[PDB]
Ligand binder design. Structure first.
Ligand SMILES: Nc1ncnc2c1ncn2[C@@H]1O[C@H](COCC#Cc2nc3c(N)ncnc3n2Cc2ccccc2)[C@@H](O)[C@H]1O
Ligand SMILES: Nc1ncnc2c1ncn2[C@@H]1O[C@H](COCC#Cc2nc3c(N)ncnc3n2Cc2ccccc2)[C@@H](O)[C@H]1O
Ligand SMILES: Nc1ncnc2c1ncn2[C@@H]1O[C@H](COCC#Cc2nc3c(N)ncnc3n2Cc2ccccc2)[C@@H](O)[C@H]1O
Ligand SMILES: Nc1ncnc2c1ncn2[C@@H]1O[C@H](COCC#Cc2nc3c(N)ncnc3n2Cc2ccccc2)[C@@H](O)[C@H]1O
Lengths: 257, 257, 257, 257
């Protein structure tokens, strides 16, 4: 079937990519980077992130596979020495799906995040009213906020004190960035985990310009009226050829390998 | 139908209890503390916790209601001035259900937790191997561990840095208590959120005696071979007469009321 | 003696300033904003911060006084209703001194901080080697670092998990901003408190452009070779007319007033 | 001069101890475990802790030396292969001194801590009023409190989120253990660093029985009226034969060796 391979760009990844293409030439496989059914990423989680956003409009029709040429990644969880076996097994697997985060920015633009979406100020103080399902929950003062997908909880969310969620749980997690807490300003402090169909809305107080990130991309948005967070109805699909449990991936990346 | 009322024991709660019993006498309502269909708790979350464990063998046949004579509780979320209206509406509501945590202690005893279950040492050093779905995840050294239900995340779990989970998510959350982290000992540090059907097993390394807590109860267990944590198949059922959202309960308890 | 008064700029502060000037006119007091011996700040800690940096070249010859027209500040710890008494007592007090932080940026520029100095990347990843007294301590990956003065520990340092230090201790405190910690990248995690004469040096790894903040000021520095942190030999001097203990100031600002 | 050697008790430490005693026999050195001038500890920091408390009444007359038969310790910072060189150099060094923590328990007993002193409840809820220099600072609700010496900040204090203090700073650090924070109960949250001559006093609210730890020792104290913390006037003295900086010790123990 139709496939394509993106590469980190270094010598190691490009030649691993050329070898798999050559290996795919021995099977009924058509290279196509317009409408592929299989997207293979060779590099790190950053390369996989780019591969995801390159084809975020055909998620229901693509099974992703990640190969790590360097250290173990959470999305690129195949060793390079397994590419030939990967080519073989891919020629003739099941699919597992991870939840995604929908970000809506009204002034309206919508973005999909595999890891997380963050909001920071354009330079001055960051102050937003946090609204959960249309009820005002808190007025946040600090450096910013981060809304994480389950699989994204091992990334930026983890460094901010958030919990690690198993990707089978359809949820999003909001964590604070250096929140001010005194007698007058008050935030919840704890990370918040929201289920499907809950809407978290960030609304300006004085400044209306925000630096909004979605995975690796970060754009300054001007005259923002609202930022809306919710678990996406779309999901990313992985091709699994064996058992690599998420908690084992966490152990291999953080405890020891 | 059959009902009963437990009380904090102070003058305020006992006389609120006697007034509701008198109010129930004007309706087709039978007091029965053996097989009640409605269990009303008057006091704080501690009183509600006791009411829960008093009838933990008839959870599928009981709808709980909590009344707070003091400050707002997460389970006792009815003001005392609403008892007469509560009696009326209860005479003729829907049910919402929260997940529970199953704790298995092998030497075998099983316990149900509405808030959380914690493990600490019997005095010496606390060292356990943490096993997730039969794979060894980490060797924990520290003061102890805490496995929290969703509704329990606002309690002990919150004070340990855990995330607040909406009770619609069937999950459990494990948080660390003063874990040692240096070149030789290594824990994940972050809280871990587990879905249904994941089993977390704590296993001794040297000392086999542990102080195990389940909600308010805390018992020293001797010659422990394993402690097993998993989301319970049983659920607690609340009688809801109006909308009091969980995130609003969080806001009222922690931000301001 | 010579004095001057800076104001927040609102109607409340300007008219409090005009009343104190009028009150000072009844005494042997000369207004002079070039070489004052007494600098009075009317507003918040931000106004006091500006008053400090306005005269940072005559610190050994100035006693600062802060008046808070809004909430209690840590530097502006005089209520507006005490200005007349303040004018009187100032006409005829002792001095207490707080440590300051010296920041050296080599490409060489030196800055003095009353609260803290922070380092962040110019957009990309922030990676610096942390060198303590010429020995390499760690390679930091994350959002940035913050070096705080003692009196500054109640400000940005506090929101990042740092400890509150009594200003009698001549020290500086380094805290991390969302540090990455996995199998490959490793930071200390804990805040670090350094005594006088210890030098903490930040040194680039790839990117050489950093956004460096000093109190309220924040400037993008290009082609940085090193950022050096050390407890300053200069100190800020406060005019004290009564006992307002630091721990009481902490209690009034964070516990309740 | 007079000396003695304490041992971990394993085969490795006992025979290292016998070899150094034999090596000391070739010099003008007298073994004496009653009034030694040099106390050598062979084992880990736990062995050194025991050696410290064994001679805590002759601290002004003893220079301590620690040898680690296992991993690197913060007090036992000499490799076993250097014992012969240690014997030689000790035969003919300077002294460095670290601050200590004085704990007073009134009902009156006083204890000295090299690492820290902690307070927990006897089983029920732990509630204490925290008083700093006779002013009431906070009412603490939680699992307990920990007051750490500077060199103790790398131990229990570190696991509780406290800052690492260089031992040249004469100070103590108070950190919280799972403090409850909601609308009604409020603690400072941040670690507190106190200078010399500041007195921190813990005072009961309901329960008067506390489990008080001092380094490795932990005793249940009954009918406590007050627990007083302050930087001790006594200091521990180390024999230094070379430069092993504290920050290097921190790096070797926590970053990598
Ligand atoms: N302070 C920060 N701590 C943690 N991550 C941060 C921080 N700042 C920005 N980012 C991130 O950059 C990302 C864009 O680039 C590609 C990627 C990725 C990735 N994804 C994961 C994951 N799911 N699990 C574990 N490792 C991961 N990495 C690897 C990684 C670890 C640490 C830093 C950067 C990258 C964006 O996904 C932000 O999360
Ligand atoms: N350090 C600690 N921090 C927080 N809680 C702790 C700590 N130590 C032990 N407990 C707890 O005692 C409980 C048994 O008594 C009854 C109850 C309850 C309760 N449940 C909740 C809840 N779900 N949401 C919010 N408030 C709650 N409370 C009120 C409450 C707040 C703080 C302390 C105690 C009680 C057991 O449920 C442990 O969680
Ligand atoms: N996330 C953050 N959390 C905390 N402070 C942050 C954060 N981001 C930037 N700042 C800060 O802005 C400052 C420049 O403006 C003037 C000032 C001041 C001040 N000084 C103190 C103090 N010593 N003690 C208590 N209150 C203080 N404030 C008041 C205050 C509290 C919180 C935010 C801003 C201001 C600079 O001193 C940064 O510390
Ligand atoms: N959760 C906890 N985390 C950290 N330490 C804890 C915890 N619980 C109790 N202790 C401690 O046991 C101690 C008594 O035994 C001897 C000792 C020592 C020691 N001293 C230090 C130090 N100064 N620097 C680094 N390593 C140290 N260790 C080694 C060590 C590390 C971790 C646990 C135990 C021991 C007492 O000093 C408590 O601090």
């Amino acid at each position: 079937m139709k496939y394509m391979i993106t590469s980190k760009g270094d010598e190691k990844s490009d030649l691993l990519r050329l070898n798999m293409i050559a290996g795919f030439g021995e099977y009924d496989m058509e290279y196509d980077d317009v409408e592929p059914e299989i997207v293979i990423s060779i590099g790190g989680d950053g390369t996989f992130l780019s591969a995801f956003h390159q084809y975020e409009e055909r998620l229901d029709e693509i099974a992703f596979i990640g190969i790590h040429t360097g250290h173990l990644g959470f999305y690129a969880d195949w060793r390079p020495a397994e590419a030939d076996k990967l080519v073989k097994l891919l020629a003739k697997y099941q699919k597992v799906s991870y939840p995604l985060l929908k970000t809506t920015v009204k002034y309206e633009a919508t973005y999909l995040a595999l890891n997380e979406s963050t909001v920071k100020s354009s330079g001055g103080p960051f102050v937003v009213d946090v609204v959960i399902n249309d009820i005002h929950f808190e007025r946040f003062r600090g450096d910013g906020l981060c809304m994480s997908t389950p699989s994204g909880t091992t990334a930026y969310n983890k460094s901010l004190g958030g919990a690690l969620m198993h990707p089978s749980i359809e949820a999003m997690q909001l964590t604070e960035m250096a929140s001010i807490n005194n007698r007058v300003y008050r935030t919840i402090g704890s990370p918040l985990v929201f289920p499907k169909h809950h809407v978290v809305s960030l609304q300006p107080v004085n400044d209306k310009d925000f630096q909004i990130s979605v995975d690796h991309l970060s754009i300054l948005h001007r005259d923002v009226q609202e930022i809306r967070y919710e678990v996406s109805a779309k999901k990313i699909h992985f091709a699994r050829f064996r058992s690599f449990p998420f908690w084992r991936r966490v152990h291999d990346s953080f405890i020891e390998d």
